[PDB]
Design an enzyme around this catalytic site. Structure first.
Site, PDB file in Angstrom:
ATOM      1  N   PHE A 121     -20.916   6.582  -8.727  1.00 33.43           N
ATOM      2  CA  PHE A 121     -19.755   6.371  -9.568  1.00 33.43           C
ATOM      3  C   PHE A 121     -18.880   5.267  -8.979  1.00 33.43           C
ATOM      4  CE2 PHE A 121     -15.333   7.847 -10.740  1.00 33.43           C
ATOM      5  CZ  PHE A 121     -15.406   7.366 -12.039  1.00 33.43           C
ATOM      6  N   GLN A 122     -18.562   4.274  -9.800  1.00 31.52           N
ATOM      7  CA  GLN A 122     -17.734   3.149  -9.381  1.00 31.52           C
ATOM      8  C   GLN A 122     -18.230   2.441  -8.119  1.00 31.52           C
ATOM      9  OE1 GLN A 122     -13.390   4.321  -9.629  1.00 31.52           O
ATOM     10  NE2 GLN A 122     -13.773   3.191 -11.544  1.00 31.52           N
ATOM     11  N   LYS A 171     -15.273   5.779   1.566  1.00 30.51           N
ATOM     12  CA  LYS A 171     -14.284   6.835   1.440  1.00 30.51           C
ATOM     13  C   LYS A 171     -14.410   7.905   2.525  1.00 30.51           C
ATOM     14  CE  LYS A 171     -12.281   9.828  -2.115  1.00 30.51           C
ATOM     15  NZ  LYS A 171     -12.818  11.159  -1.739  1.00 30.51           N
ATOM     16  N   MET A 485      -5.962 -30.029 -20.598  1.00 32.12           N
ATOM     17  CA  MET A 485      -6.961 -30.828 -19.906  1.00 32.12           C
ATOM     18  C   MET A 485      -8.271 -30.953 -20.677  1.00 32.12           C
ATOM     19  SD  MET A 485      -7.334 -32.796 -17.385  1.00 32.12           S
ATOM     20  CE  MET A 485      -6.039 -32.440 -16.194  1.00 32.12           C
TER      21      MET A 485
HETATM   22  C1  LIG Z   1     -13.037   8.650 -15.279  1.00 28.52           C
HETATM   23  C2  LIG Z   1     -14.504   8.920 -15.470  1.00 28.52           C
HETATM   24  C3  LIG Z   1     -14.935  10.276 -15.561  1.00 28.52           C
HETATM   25  C4  LIG Z   1     -16.290  10.585 -15.908  1.00 28.52           C
HETATM   26  N1  LIG Z   1     -16.592  11.907 -16.160  1.00 28.52           N
HETATM   27  C5  LIG Z   1     -17.836  12.212 -16.665  1.00 28.52           C
HETATM   28  C6  LIG Z   1     -18.170  13.612 -16.977  1.00 28.52           C
HETATM   29  O1  LIG Z   1     -17.400  14.534 -16.684  1.00 28.52           O
HETATM   30  N2  LIG Z   1     -19.443  13.843 -17.562  1.00 28.52           N
HETATM   31  C7  LIG Z   1     -20.363  12.792 -17.789  1.00 28.52           C
HETATM   32  O2  LIG Z   1     -21.413  12.985 -18.409  1.00 28.52           O
HETATM   33  N3  LIG Z   1     -20.098  11.531 -17.426  1.00 28.52           N
HETATM   34  C8  LIG Z   1     -18.872  11.192 -16.882  1.00 28.52           C
HETATM   35  N4  LIG Z   1     -18.590   9.860 -16.512  1.00 28.52           N
HETATM   36  C9  LIG Z   1     -19.575   8.784 -16.899  1.00 28.52           C
HETATM   37  C10 LIG Z   1     -20.501   8.694 -15.759  1.00 28.52           C
HETATM   38  O3  LIG Z   1     -20.017   7.847 -14.713  1.00 28.52           O
HETATM   39  C11 LIG Z   1     -21.897   8.132 -16.087  1.00 28.52           C
HETATM   40  O4  LIG Z   1     -21.621   6.761 -16.713  1.00 28.52           O
HETATM   41  C12 LIG Z   1     -22.706   8.898 -17.186  1.00 28.52           C
HETATM   42  O5  LIG Z   1     -22.779  10.345 -16.710  1.00 28.52           O
HETATM   43  C13 LIG Z   1     -24.061   8.325 -17.276  1.00 28.52           C
HETATM   44  O6  LIG Z   1     -24.777   9.091 -18.301  1.00 28.52           O
HETATM   45  P1  LIG Z   1     -26.251   8.762 -18.687  1.00 28.52           P
HETATM   46  O7  LIG Z   1     -27.031   8.899 -17.435  1.00 28.52           O
HETATM   47  O8  LIG Z   1     -26.606   9.710 -19.682  1.00 28.52           O
HETATM   48  O9  LIG Z   1     -26.336   7.321 -19.356  1.00 28.52           O
HETATM   49  P2  LIG Z   1     -26.755   5.886 -18.792  1.00 28.52           P
HETATM   50  O10 LIG Z   1     -26.048   5.706 -17.553  1.00 28.52           O
HETATM   51  O11 LIG Z   1     -26.563   4.972 -19.943  1.00 28.52           O
HETATM   52  O12 LIG Z   1     -28.193   6.000 -18.375  1.00 28.52           O
HETATM   53  C14 LIG Z   1     -29.218   6.089 -19.424  1.00 28.52           C
HETATM   54  C15 LIG Z   1     -30.548   6.319 -18.775  1.00 28.52           C
HETATM   55  O13 LIG Z   1     -31.466   6.357 -19.866  1.00 28.52           O
HETATM   56  C16 LIG Z   1     -32.574   5.531 -19.578  1.00 28.52           C
HETATM   57  N5  LIG Z   1     -33.071   5.053 -20.956  1.00 28.52           N
HETATM   58  C17 LIG Z   1     -32.465   3.901 -21.627  1.00 28.52           C
HETATM   59  N6  LIG Z   1     -32.970   3.589 -22.786  1.00 28.52           N
HETATM   60  C18 LIG Z   1     -33.955   4.492 -22.982  1.00 28.52           C
HETATM   61  C19 LIG Z   1     -35.023   4.833 -24.067  1.00 28.52           C
HETATM   62  N7  LIG Z   1     -35.108   4.134 -25.174  1.00 28.52           N
HETATM   63  N8  LIG Z   1     -35.934   5.948 -23.859  1.00 28.52           N
HETATM   64  C20 LIG Z   1     -35.876   6.749 -22.660  1.00 28.52           C
HETATM   65  N9  LIG Z   1     -34.959   6.530 -21.630  1.00 28.52           N
HETATM   66  C21 LIG Z   1     -34.026   5.409 -21.821  1.00 28.52           C
HETATM   67  C22 LIG Z   1     -32.020   4.459 -18.631  1.00 28.52           C
HETATM   68  O14 LIG Z   1     -32.833   3.486 -18.121  1.00 28.52           O
HETATM   69  C23 LIG Z   1     -31.208   5.325 -17.728  1.00 28.52           C
HETATM   70  O15 LIG Z   1     -31.856   5.937 -16.634  1.00 28.52           O
HETATM   71  C24 LIG Z   1     -17.268   9.502 -16.123  1.00 28.52           C
HETATM   72  C25 LIG Z   1     -16.833   8.152 -15.938  1.00 28.52           C
HETATM   73  C26 LIG Z   1     -15.474   7.839 -15.682  1.00 28.52           C
HETATM   74  C27 LIG Z   1     -15.074   6.374 -15.723  1.00 28.52           C
HETATM   75  C1  LIG Z   2      -7.376 -30.153 -12.779  1.00 30.66           C
HETATM   76  C2  LIG Z   2      -7.621 -30.594 -11.362  1.00 30.66           C
HETATM   77  C3  LIG Z   2      -7.493 -31.980 -11.054  1.00 30.66           C
HETATM   78  C4  LIG Z   2      -7.551 -32.430  -9.695  1.00 30.66           C
HETATM   79  N1  LIG Z   2      -7.236 -33.751  -9.453  1.00 30.66           N
HETATM   80  C5  LIG Z   2      -7.110 -34.167  -8.146  1.00 30.66           C
HETATM   81  C6  LIG Z   2      -6.738 -35.563  -7.861  1.00 30.66           C
HETATM   82  O1  LIG Z   2      -6.652 -36.401  -8.768  1.00 30.66           O
HETATM   83  N2  LIG Z   2      -6.557 -35.903  -6.494  1.00 30.66           N
HETATM   84  C7  LIG Z   2      -6.769 -34.965  -5.457  1.00 30.66           C
HETATM   85  O2  LIG Z   2      -6.490 -35.235  -4.285  1.00 30.66           O
HETATM   86  N3  LIG Z   2      -7.193 -33.720  -5.707  1.00 30.66           N
HETATM   87  C8  LIG Z   2      -7.364 -33.276  -7.006  1.00 30.66           C
HETATM   88  N4  LIG Z   2      -7.799 -31.959  -7.266  1.00 30.66           N
HETATM   89  C9  LIG Z   2      -7.885 -30.990  -6.113  1.00 30.66           C
HETATM   90  C10 LIG Z   2      -9.258 -31.130  -5.605  1.00 30.66           C
HETATM   91  O3  LIG Z   2     -10.202 -30.328  -6.323  1.00 30.66           O
HETATM   92  C11 LIG Z   2      -9.462 -30.726  -4.133  1.00 30.66           C
HETATM   93  O4  LIG Z   2      -8.966 -29.279  -4.059  1.00 30.66           O
HETATM   94  C12 LIG Z   2      -8.580 -31.485  -3.085  1.00 30.66           C
HETATM   95  O5  LIG Z   2      -8.862 -32.967  -3.308  1.00 30.66           O
HETATM   96  C13 LIG Z   2      -8.996 -31.089  -1.727  1.00 30.66           C
HETATM   97  O6  LIG Z   2      -8.156 -31.843  -0.792  1.00 30.66           O
HETATM   98  P1  LIG Z   2      -8.298 -31.675   0.752  1.00 30.66           P
HETATM   99  O7  LIG Z   2      -9.701 -32.030   1.065  1.00 30.66           O
HETATM  100  O8  LIG Z   2      -7.349 -32.563   1.322  1.00 30.66           O
HETATM  101  O9  LIG Z   2      -7.884 -30.201   1.185  1.00 30.66           O
HETATM  102  P2  LIG Z   2      -8.733 -28.893   1.530  1.00 30.66           P
HETATM  103  O10 LIG Z   2      -9.701 -28.738   0.477  1.00 30.66           O
HETATM  104  O11 LIG Z   2      -7.710 -27.857   1.811  1.00 30.66           O
HETATM  105  O12 LIG Z   2      -9.561 -29.233   2.735  1.00 30.66           O
HETATM  106  C14 LIG Z   2      -8.885 -29.357   4.034  1.00 30.66           C
HETATM  107  C15 LIG Z   2      -9.881 -29.819   5.052  1.00 30.66           C
HETATM  108  O13 LIG Z   2      -9.138 -29.874   6.267  1.00 30.66           O
HETATM  109  C16 LIG Z   2      -9.864 -29.231   7.292  1.00 30.66           C
HETATM  110  N5  LIG Z   2      -8.787 -28.695   8.255  1.00 30.66           N
HETATM  111  C17 LIG Z   2      -8.117 -27.416   8.012  1.00 30.66           C
HETATM  112  N6  LIG Z   2      -7.225 -27.065   8.895  1.00 30.66           N
HETATM  113  C18 LIG Z   2      -7.231 -28.066   9.800  1.00 30.66           C
HETATM  114  C19 LIG Z   2      -6.500 -28.442  11.127  1.00 30.66           C
HETATM  115  N7  LIG Z   2      -5.577 -27.659  11.633  1.00 30.66           N
HETATM  116  N8  LIG Z   2      -6.836 -29.681  11.812  1.00 30.66           N
HETATM  117  C20 LIG Z   2      -7.841 -30.575  11.290  1.00 30.66           C
HETATM  118  N9  LIG Z   2      -8.550 -30.336  10.112  1.00 30.66           N
HETATM  119  C21 LIG Z   2      -8.226 -29.090   9.402  1.00 30.66           C
HETATM  120  C22 LIG Z   2     -10.722 -28.189   6.563  1.00 30.66           C
HETATM  121  O14 LIG Z   2     -11.584 -27.383   7.253  1.00 30.66           O
HETATM  122  C23 LIG Z   2     -11.203 -29.022   5.423  1.00 30.66           C
HETATM  123  O15 LIG Z   2     -12.355 -29.813   5.619  1.00 30.66           O
HETATM  124  C24 LIG Z   2      -7.797 -31.469  -8.603  1.00 30.66           C
HETATM  125  C25 LIG Z   2      -8.011 -30.098  -8.946  1.00 30.66           C
HETATM  126  C26 LIG Z   2      -7.868 -29.635 -10.279  1.00 30.66           C
HETATM  127  C27 LIG Z   2      -7.896 -28.132 -10.504  1.00 30.66           C
END
Ligand SMILES: Cc1cc2nc3c(=O)[nH]c(=O)nc-3n(C[C@H](O)[C@H](O)[C@H](O)COP(=O)(O)OP(=O)(O)OC[C@H]3O[C@@H](n4cnc5c(N)ncnc54)[C@H](O)[C@@H]3O)c2cc1C
Ligand SMILES: Cc1cc2nc3c(=O)[nH]c(=O)nc-3n(C[C@H](O)[C@H](O)[C@H](O)COP(=O)(O)OP(=O)(O)OC[C@H]3O[C@@H](n4cnc5c(N)ncnc54)[C@H](O)[C@@H]3O)c2cc1C
Ligand SMILES: Cc1cc2nc3c(=O)[nH]c(=O)nc-3n(C[C@H](O)[C@H](O)[C@H](O)COP(=O)(O)OP(=O)(O)OC[C@H]3O[C@@H](n4cnc5c(N)ncnc54)[C@H](O)[C@@H]3O)c2cc1C
Ligand SMILES: CCOC(=O)c1ccccc1S(=O)(=O)NC(=O)Nc1nc(Cl)cc(OC)n1
Ligand SMILES: CCOC(=O)c1ccccc1S(=O)(=O)NC(=O)Nc1nc(Cl)cc(OC)n1
Ligand SMILES: CCOC(=O)c1ccccc1S(=O)(=O)NC(=O)Nc1nc(Cl)cc(OC)n1
Ligand SMILES: [Mg+2]
Ligand SMILES: [Mg+2]
Ligand SMILES: [Mg+2]
Lengths: 582, 582, 582
Positions: A121-122, A171, A485
């Protein structure tokens, strides 16, 4: 020095050992969204009196907030999530932090060990999923390892080239009672062995020599200089070399200074890319020669000796082969080169006035410019106004797209860590959450999220977080009803053929949709819309003066284009200097 | 038969070949959010006249919508995203589809091939990242492969045990011109070789024998029976065996029928878990013996012969060892067993009336129940009302948590694919997007998203999608200001010590926060709040009658607890039947 | 109980901790070839007085010897190698042990931790390389982990389905001083959680029921019955069911007994494959339904109820779907079924005389046969003679090919672990080294390696080992100057077109080449050649009587073919019963 809440001989839950492990690391803030597999961790968190938790409304908000926190403070950002869907929701944040080199420690709950691999679970094989998008990660298999793993995670996340480290905790290990040993050594023999040593004078003096032998030197500063603000400054006032910056380096050197060539690259200033194109000496400090700034590698700084200083040897020579390289902390390299420059001052007598002049004429002939139509608000102007009213001392976070480029171009950052933007991955929806983290890390600062309507709505649920945590986050929303952009590219390369880039409602093509004001209202956040350029200055001032959070929806004509522009894989000679979608 | 838009000898973009590949697969709907690396695909999409695109507001909305589409139709769901952040934003959806076995094909744009592995702009090793959370995935390395890969992707996604398949397409391959070959054979020799063959009579007749030799038989139906509605029905009217269902199987057999024991498991009915606990023959059709329904394996159906029919051999014997097993399509197994049962009808003369009676008394002594306090609205009742006013013919999607369990318990599904809920991964924020996909797949159906305030806000941005696509999505929001399920566990196992589970505003603890009505308003969606149980029936009726989308915010007392409840790893003898947080 | 050589508070090298870890596991013999990265381990080994080391001449000889040791004793085999080339030379042995499910612990030296991943001297990512060919493996990263890892390695190697486990130990950890903790618990929560529980009577009695309801039952025994000799015997004398065996199961049930159908499969007896083809009940105990014995799956035991008992759930239903299955130790299942059979003896009164008769006529009409030409020695006859002179009590190891099939067909094994042969991987060069390990594990037994000239020469260097360790290893070399098995296939499917299958010298096509006698001479091992069938009996007797090692080179006509033969993917109706290469 550190006061525990447990007796040195008193056994306690692994969850409590993990929380104390964080306290011992100096952590004061985490961004955690509770889930079944992480409940123990949350319970232990409430027993802590030094760590505060900012509950986001989405795990992605959590990571991005942690990034904002990290990016604006220089400290690692910490986010915690439950197993499965909780963990997978962190992915974009992890990849984002890895690409921009942001120190970050992510902790995820996991199903009990015996349940792992059973399709429980999760359950999600999060360690397998994130291996290629984290600096390193762990699956804790014994409560006895918590202290060591947490210490290693932070060490790795913050040392060398910063990056994200994820720690998966079953956990059953959270509930297991035990007595922690905070004396255990870290098992990073290989990593600690490869950590760069302080720069050698032989290497540094060779650079100073090159500087004295050059006629057209250019500094190419990046994100690696974020902690070398002073050193870089001193270095520039000793060499008088013009500074060009990457999107990640903005603020390392004041954009307002006369020696500043501002940003280079695809959307860099004509004079910045000019300087590099014709330089004979390229001082690449803390940069990774990204395709965004280099364009066609063979053409990039083709006529010049390249000096590359990076903390990551894997970067030196990856895309460009230097004539000189220094693998180490640029901060130390600068301090070293500075002493040398101060001594051989008279002996050297460096003068690049002629080069600077050649560039000043370029800066004069091809400056950043925007056009004003009637009373429509020009986004560039809006940002320009924000800059003035905040005296350029605000922390600016942003989304991704045109507004991002404008936020970069028209705001003059005085210091580094004032600019929080996703550069390498370029993830939309980053702006609002990043602002949240930045504000928590800087309670007395002006924090403004310059967002786009597309990016803003992606994590709009975080408005709830802002209100509840009572954070003074200001949102300057440059609303253009489009995915700017992508639209610009449609105009330039697809004959303006629109392909799902309109964000408004086709049934009421003229109505601003959605009504972002009502999103703010829903979360009890005061808001206002502004459409006339004449009312802009007062609206922004209001936003700033109104205590607490505030959302200013700024309507802009969508046909605006970001310029200048060097198309992908292009040369300085392919730069586009004019045009829009009108 | 299929009419192309290109001459059989006319070269065209790989993007166009990909879109036609989809048309040839019968695709009519995709959920795609444009980005730089997928622009070509979007452009080709606008040239298609048979495929419609529903532009979500977040990639996660895209996947979840695609899932809803798939889950409500039996067709594969198709989502498309750009590279990097676009792709990583799909992750939770992919893992969700894999755990619940939902057929889904995800297509992501990728940087040009030559750029792969260079830490390029918006690059993410998506194929590496998703390998453990997809049924299979691909990285297209030649425009010539598109036809084959797309055909294989759909075949794999829909055949055997359904699941998600991701196809990564480099931008250079999207732009490469070529003449497609739709005659190429698929390279799935191993997979096609392992595909289950139709069930053997020897195996099937052995089962019918066991049925005739049993005194306490119980059907344990799951998601695998979603396409065996008729066959299962016929089978039950031939054996008169009581049907217990999983959360994934709801609706395979009408919950309203007298032979229905409803849901079993952690939150299953006392009589359903009773039937299984004391059965001597367990007919497990289309189930995976999840920990949620079995509790402590050794104790699950301890005194009975287990017959397991699964399409995935890897499932047969994974957690429980059957006394008989059939690896194949349960739909065919039922048709087979049915013919046998019809013939040996008189010879067999099956009568489980005595067993059914033992269960009916159990169903009478321990039925699902809820308490009504003053005029406060009981969520269970709200769902019960929705059921009545919709005559139980609505498609219900949900978030994850208490409301999910109540939506499962108090609504009687007549058919399968009426229930759309994330069961294995249990991802919050699934309900609204799933409803979007379900509505597009079922234009003339009543689609209601029974959401929680925590889950609803996570992908609240999709309200914009609903309005713009003008979809009649109804939202029954059971607002309790908390993360219900986590809160319930805090009450039961942590002395009600709250740990970040309150979603409202601590400064105004009594005000409903946020105001979900204003979220609807922002997207031009009519909404209303209801607080008194007396006004409930009319509010829901209004929601249903008001044409188009509608949001009904239903306030509920948070101290409600989902019952009954068997704690994790528990036995039927540990079932909790009473209590709440008051 | 265990007496250490160090004080409970005395720190010592990790190497010494590792050696003691072995002593505490009961290890008395290891096969280790020294190298730079494992020197410490070897030094610590000489301080041990309970562990003896057999130094092979090649690491592959080491593993194969360890396998022989394991296969002939039921204990795990232990081999140790240095890093890089030492480790890679183990690969074939590891894969061999995994495919045949042989308990084995391999320990490899590794470069110091800090050196890992640096392309260091003699470094090989052995853990990465062997992950897919071992049951599990480890990279020790802390001297503190040695005790736990070694305990886990042996537990995993010998428990459940046996297999090889490799433990990589960095040189720095071997030299690190520390005080071992032999009280640490193993971290195998998931594995120990999935370990099969003792069989249930409900399952077992269902089988006894099937046996009583069958008219044509057949036992299909494999390697999983190697420790159930007595239980199986008792079971057969209680049911009188004919026993068919796999190449891996030979000896579980005496091949000389009248109830024995001998080996089934590709080269199985006509009557064995007959029995299975027409059986109505297949009792598959400790088998994995390999393609070698099943041929075309759909046709295999097509008309019968299959009962499969395996300790590995992953095997149950992998290729064949049973009508009944029991996941657990076949040894326990038999003991259980035996008690039931003894009680319901009179009530059951099982009589399969009619079925056995149908098979006896088949055994009479189609028995194993060989042709004798002039005075040429028939390999089948040679083996038959060895059987007689050794009274079938010898431990027989073999190479791979025709001689292997003949060693299987014409020797009657009385007990399991008398037959040592590579079945799943079928690695040549296994015979001589395996005999070495078998002899060390069984000092007072007759150990004969029935080798082929191709297989024998591959690890001929081990003759040196045999002499130096003064082991009474007898080598019955069936020399046919060819790669027999490949040659047979050339004859049958390639019109006898020879493709590099002749092992002699083309310049002297009639001279036996090489002269294996001189290989023996080089290592001071008495040898002799025999060419006339009349002199065969005396030569073999001489080999057996001559104290110590001995090599008897037996010349045979190469045109011999192994029969009968069912071609790959064939049916019992495709069986070839006559023909050769003349
Ligand atoms: C807050 C929370 C609380 C929960 N409480 C409960 C609870 O109290 N009771 C509960 O039941 N669940 C609960 N769950 C859901 C739970 O985590 C599981 O997702 C669920 O029990 C999985 O059920 P399943 O095995 O039947 O289905 P799935 O996980 O969908 O698994 C289906 C299975 O069927 C097989 N299969 C697929 N297609 C076919 C086909 N055509 N023919 C033959 N086999 C096939 C798969 O490969 C697989 O092994 C909870 C989840 C959350 C988020
Ligand atoms: C929409 C968009 C547009 C962009 N346009 C531009 C643009 O036009 N021009 C531009 O510059 N960038 C632009 N960027 C940013 C770009 O993607 C890079 O993130 C940026 O150029 C990285 O710069 P930097 O190498 O200097 O820094 P960093 O990526 O932070 O790299 C730093 C470097 O320094 C080293 N270093 C770290 N600490 C130390 C220390 N104490 N002593 C010595 N060395 C150290 C690192 O290990 C590394 O190699 C844009 C980004 C986006 C999202
Ligand atoms: C040249 C050549 C020709 C061959 N020809 C033939 C042929 O004609 N006929 C033939 O039979 N083979 C033949 N083989 C061997 C063949 O490749 C397979 O190795 C063999 O068939 C495997 O038999 P097995 O499944 O019984 O044993 P194994 O492969 O040893 O498998 C044993 C099985 O028993 C299970 N098990 C283990 N311990 C226990 C326990 N305590 N309780 C319950 N279950 C347990 C295992 O986990 C596994 O599934 C040939 C090989 C070669 C090299
Ligand atoms: C959701 C986390 O789940 C797990 O860690 C988990 C997974 C498989 C088996 C047992 C557990 S468990 O018994 O250690 N824990 C739970 O099952 N916890 C749990 N918490 C909440 Cl809030 C709800 C729930 O089930 C509906 N289950
Ligand atoms: C975002 C996708 O990027 C890529 O595919 C990509 C990556 C590295 C190098 C070249 C390209 S590219 O030249 O084939 N394509 C682009 O660079 N496209 C692109 N599209 C938009 Cl809309 C914006 C942008 O850069 C700011 N770039
Ligand atoms: C061959 C094993 O090598 C190593 O473990 C090794 C690898 C890289 C760096 C240092 C060492 S080391 O200093 O811990 N050990 C050695 O270098 N040992 C070593 N042993 C032998 Cl007989 C020969 C040799 O080098 C020629 N080197
Ligand atoms: Mg926009
Ligand atoms: Mg809620
Ligand atoms: Mg030969």
């Amino acid at each position: 020095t550190f006061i525990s809440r447990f007796a040195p001989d008193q056994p306690r839950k692994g969850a409590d050992i993990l929380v104390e492990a964080l306290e011992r690391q100096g952590v004061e803030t985490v961004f955690a969204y509770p889930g079944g597999a992480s409940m123990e961790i949350h319970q232990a968190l409430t027993r802590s009196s030094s760590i505060r938790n900012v509950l986001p409304r989405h795990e992605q908000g959590g990571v991005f907030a942690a990034e904002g926190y990290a990016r604006s403070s220089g400290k690692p950002g910490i986010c915690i999530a439950t197993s499965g869907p909780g963990a997978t929701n962190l992915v974009s944040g992890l990849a984002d932090a890895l690409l921009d080199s942001v120190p970050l420690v992510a902790i995820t709950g996991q199903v009990p060990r015996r349940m792992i691999g059973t399709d429980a679970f999760q359950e999600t094989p999060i360690v397998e999923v994130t291996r290629s998008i984290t600096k390193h990660n762990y699956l804790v298999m014994d409560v006895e390892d918590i202290p060591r793993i947490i210490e290693e995670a932070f060490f790795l996340a913050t040392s060398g080239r910063p990056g994200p480290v994820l720690v998966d905790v079953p956990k059953d290990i959270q509930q297991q009672l035990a007595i922690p040993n905070w004396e255990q050594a870290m098992r990073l023999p290989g990593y600690m062995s490869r950590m760069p040593k302080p720069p050698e004078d032989s290497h540094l003096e060779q650079i100073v020599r090159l500087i004295s032998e050059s006629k057209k030197p250019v500094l190419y500063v990046g994100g690696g200089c974020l902690n070398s603000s002073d050193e870089l400054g001193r270095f520039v006032e000793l060499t008088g070399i013009p500074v060009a910056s990457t999107l990640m380096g903005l603020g390392s050197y004041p954009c307002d200074d006369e020696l500043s060539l501002h940003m280079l690259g695809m959307h860099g200033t004509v004079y910045a890319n000019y300087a590099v194109e014709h330089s004979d000496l390229l001082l690449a400090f803390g940069v990774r020669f990204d395709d965004r700034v280099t364009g066609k590698l063979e053409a990039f700084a083709s006529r010049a000796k390249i000096v590359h200083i990076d903390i990551d040897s894997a970067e030196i020579g990856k895309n460009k082969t230097p004539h000189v390289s220094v693998c180490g902390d640029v901060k130390l390299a600068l301090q070293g080169m500075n002493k040398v420059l101060e001594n051989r001052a008279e002996e050297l007598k460096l003068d690049f006035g002629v080069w600077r002049n050649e560039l000043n004429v370029q800066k004069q002939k091809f400056p950043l410019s925007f056009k004003t139509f009637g009373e429509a608000i020009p986004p560039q102007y809006a940002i320009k106004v924000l800059d003035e009213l905040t005296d350029g001392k605000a922390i600016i976070s942003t989304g991704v797209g045109q507004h991002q480029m404008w936020a970069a171009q028209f705001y003059n950052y005085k210091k580094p860590r004032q600019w929080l933007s996703s550069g390498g991955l370029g993830a939309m929806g980053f702006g609002l959450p990043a602002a949240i983290g930045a504000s928590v890390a800087n309670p007395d600062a002006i924090v403004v999220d310059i967002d786009g309507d597309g990016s803003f709505i992606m994590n709009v649920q975080e408005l709830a977080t802002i209100r509840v945590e009572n954070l003074p986050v200001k949102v300057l929303l440059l609303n253009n009803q489009h995915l700017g952009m992508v639209m610009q590219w449609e105009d330039r390369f697809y004959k303006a053929n629109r392909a799902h880039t309109f964000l408004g409602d086709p049934a009421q093509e003229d109505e601003i949709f959605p009504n972002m004001l009502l999103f703010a209202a829903a979360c009890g956040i005061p808001a206002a819309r502004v459409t006339k350029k004449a009312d802009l200055r007062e609206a922004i001032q209001t936003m700033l003066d109104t205590p607490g959070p505030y959302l200013l929806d700024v309507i802009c004509p969508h046909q605006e284009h970001v310029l200048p522009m060097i198309p992908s894989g292009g040369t300085f000679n392919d730069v586009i200097t004019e045009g829009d979608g009108r």
